[PDB]
Design a binder for these strands. Structure first.
Length: 111
RNA sequence: UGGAAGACCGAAACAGUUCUGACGUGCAAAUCGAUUGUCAGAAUUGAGUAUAGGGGCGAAAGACCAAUCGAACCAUCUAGU
RNA sequence: UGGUAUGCGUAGAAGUGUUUGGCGUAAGCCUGCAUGGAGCUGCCAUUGGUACAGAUCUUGGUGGAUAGUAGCAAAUAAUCGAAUGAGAGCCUUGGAGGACUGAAGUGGAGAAGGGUUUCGUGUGAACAGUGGUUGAUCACGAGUUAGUCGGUCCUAAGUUCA
RNA sequence: UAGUCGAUAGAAUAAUGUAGGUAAGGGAAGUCGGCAAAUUAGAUCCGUAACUUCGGGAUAAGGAUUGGCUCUGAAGAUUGA
RNA sequence: GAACCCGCAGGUACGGACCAAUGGCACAAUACUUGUUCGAGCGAACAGUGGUAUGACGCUACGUCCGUUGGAUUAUGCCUG
RNA sequence: AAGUUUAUAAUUUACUUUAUAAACGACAAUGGAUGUGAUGCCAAUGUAAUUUGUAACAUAGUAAAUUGGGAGGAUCUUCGAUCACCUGAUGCCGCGCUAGUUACAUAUAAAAGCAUUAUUUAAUACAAUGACAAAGCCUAGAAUCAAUUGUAAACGACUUUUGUAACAGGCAAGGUGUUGUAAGUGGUUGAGCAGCUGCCAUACUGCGAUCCACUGAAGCUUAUCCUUUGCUUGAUGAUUCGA
RNA sequence: AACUCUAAGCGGUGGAUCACUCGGCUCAUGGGUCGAUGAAGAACGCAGCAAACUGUGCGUCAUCGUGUGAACUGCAGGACACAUGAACAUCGACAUUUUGAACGCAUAUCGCAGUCCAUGCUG
C-alpha cells in the first residue's frame, strides 16, 4: 500500500536530545530524525538531504535547533529494487522561527 | 640612572615530592595524572673522544659500567661438586 | 645379530582404529573387521642407546578458563553524504560538517638513525590486536644527476704505529 | 595557515571505578600525619613584626581596589610663523 | 524523697520508607560575565561542562513519616496435700 | 483398681447421667475376621488354562428398567458445571432366580506321563493405557518475539501497549515551570564628546555604558510535566503450545 | 527439549607410529698437495628468464687443451657449431675483480698522492 503522499511534519528535537551526551548531540539528532521519518512514513529506507545536513549542523553540535521543521516525502524506490518499494526523503524547509506551524499535506512532487 | 648574584616566582628544559592515586596479565621490564623541586649556573645537552673487569667511574647510594654489578657480559675449564 | 622354519609377503607387508572371538594370575598374545601400501615375523642361541605417568622433566600438540569472560577505554570524535566495490562510520575520496594540534605544532626542514620505507600502477589472502576495495601491506615498475651543499681537506680531544 | 580527525565502533550511559567537580550547618571532630582537597594567587596602592650575618625576613602580617563607557591631563618628533 | 506502674507527651538509638516543604546537586536550562572567533549585530561556537548568579522534570539529605500482639512458661510468688 | 457392656428404673444431643442386678474380672481368652451392610474361592446341582446345559419337589425366599421433585454432602484428593438419600409418578422385558433334596445328558477333563514342574503357560476375569484406516458425541485459545510504556532495568526480566478510537504517537496550542525583560524600532533617557556655523534666533548631524516604551517580555518547559472535539500520522512483521 | 555425563560410528584438529633415506656417526686404509709466482677467508658483480644455494670474475653459472660423443630442460632464447663437437668430466694453457699476510698512505673516505709508459683534446 504505497500511498506516495508528502507532508511537512513537525519534530521537537530537544526532548529526545535531553540528557544525551554532547558530541553525540547531533549524531543522535540525525538518527532520531530518521526514527521519526520511519515511524511517519512506515518506510525503513530513510534518505536525508544535503539541505537537511547544514540546518542541524549550522549552529554547531552543543546547540542543535530545539524545534526543527521537517519536510517528509514518501517516494518510490526506482532502480536496483530495495525489498521496500518506498523511501522517505527528508529535507529542511529554511525557517529560523519554526514554532506555531502545524503540518501541511501538499508538497507537489517535482519541486 | 644602572643592572650584580652557583639570588627568588616560574616557562622551555631537567628531575621525580606526595597521592604510599591511575596502571600494576598496563601503552610501558617503570608508563600516566594531579601536585611539586629547580630553571643564567657546581645549568641543560649532542657528536667526537679517553678510562675496561677483582678493573674503571663515583657531589660516595656499594651506585652505575648497553633492562645486568656486594665485581659486567661472553666462551671455555665444565656433564665442575 | 648368528642359525633355522626349503617362514610370511604387493593375490596386500609393516603400521594403525577397532562392543571380533579366544588365551594367560599378569607381564602381554593371537585373530577378525576397516584403513594400508612394501616390506615383515616365530623359535634356539647371541648384545643393548631395551619397556615410562610423573623428574617446578624435555620437545611438540591440545583443552576448561573462553566464540568469549580480560579486553581492544587517555589525546571530546564523530557526522551528512556523493563515488565505487564482493563488502565501505573510519580505512577510498570530493563536497558538506563538528572539532583537534593551536606555529615552543600532530606543522615546514635536517642531523644522529632508518634502508627502498619514496612514488605510480595492480590490489587478495595474510598484516593494520576492528573492518580495509586502501596502506609504510602484498605483487609489478620507476625514481635520488652538483667544480660552487656536505663528505673530501684540515687539525682537536684523541688515535694507528715504524 | 599547514597538518589531523586513525587511537575498533554503536546502544545502553547500572554498580564499582578512573579522570574532573559541588555540597547546607558544623569546620579536622578525620588520620599515623591536614594526606587528598579547598582557601590564597596577578596588578596597583597602603601597611608591614620577631630575628638578623643588616644583605634580608618581605609577596611578612594586615587592608583597599580592578569591568564597560565617556571625558580630561601628562608623557615625544618636525619644520613653520 | 520513690519523675514510681495506670495515664500523657516528646526525644534517643536502631531499622524501613518517602521528595510535599526546607536543604543539597546540575539541565552544560536561562541569564550575566571574561578571553577568542563568526565583518559588526542578532543568535551562537571554542576555553574537553569556560566562569559566575539563579536554577526546574528528576534524584537525594541534615527533611519528614511509620515500627504489632498474644500464648507457652523460666526465674519466682503461690494453692491443696 | 485406670476399665469394654447389657438389661430393668430414671436420664440424655452425647455407649451421657443416676440407682439396683450382672458381665469380656490388662487370665487362658482374645487379635484376624464375627469378613463383623456375616467377603471371599461364590454363581457354578461336574467349582473350570470349557463353560456345565436341561427335569421335578416342597420350604425359606429372590426381583430387572425409566423419569420428575424436595433437601445433603467434599481436610494432599483417582472427575466439587460431581456422587448420594428420600419421596411421588410411569409403565412392562418377566431378564435373572439361589440355597436344599432328587431326575436326565455331556464336551473340558484321558496336559503320554509313568520322572509331570521346569524354559514353567494362559482361555477367561477385573483395571489402566494405546491408536492404524474407519465408526458413533462437543467446541472454536493464546503465549512468546518484534514494535511500545517507565511505575522497570547492566543484559534477560518486571510493569504498560497497539478496534478509524476508552486509540496510540509526533506536534502546535493552552495550563504549569524556569530565567528575569529578546530581537527590532523609537526617544538627546544619557556624564558627555567631535565637526560646521548664518543677514538673526541658534543648532544639528553623527558617536555614547546604560535607562525607558513596545516587554511581567523573549527563550526554555521534561524526555521520567498536565492537558487536547486543534494538526498530521500509525493501524499491514516472527514462532510455538494441547487434557 | 537444550546442555551435561557415559560409550560407539563418522568428520576435524594434530603429526605420534611404521616403513623408507643422494645424510649423519665411528673404526680402518692410501697420500701429502696453501702463501708475496699475492693464501685461506671477506666483499662486490655475473645465468635468456635467478633472488639464493652452487659456480665464476669484468673473457663473470666460464674460456683453451684433452677425453667422450649429443645434450641442457622448469619455460624457453638457444638447441644448430652432433664429422672435429653439445654437455659433463678431465682441466696440464690463460683469465682469475675489489680485498685480505696485503705491500705508496689511509679506511664512520672505494680517500688522496707520487712516478714511468701510453692515449685523446688544445697547441
Amino acid at each position: 500500500i504505497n500511498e506516495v503522499v508528502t507532508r511537512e511534519c513537525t519534530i521537537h528535537l530537544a526532548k529526545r536530545v535531553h540528557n544525551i551526551g554532547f558530541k553525540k548531540r547531533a549524531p543522535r539528532a540525525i538518527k532520531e530524525i530518521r526514527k521519526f521519518a520511519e515511524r511517519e512514513m512506515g518506510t525503513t529506507d530513510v534518505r536525508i538531504d544535503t539541505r537537511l545536513n547544514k540546518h542541524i549542523w549550522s549552529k554547531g553540535i552543543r546547540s542543535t535547533p530545539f524545534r526543527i521543521r521537517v519536510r517528509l516525502a514518501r517516494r518510490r524506490n526506482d532502480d536496483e529494487d530495495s525489498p521496500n518499494k518506498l523511501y522517505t526523503y527528508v529535507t529542511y524547509v529554511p525557517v529560523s522561527t519554526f514554532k506555531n506551524l502545524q503540518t501541511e499535506n501538499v508538497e507537489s512532487s517535482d519541486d
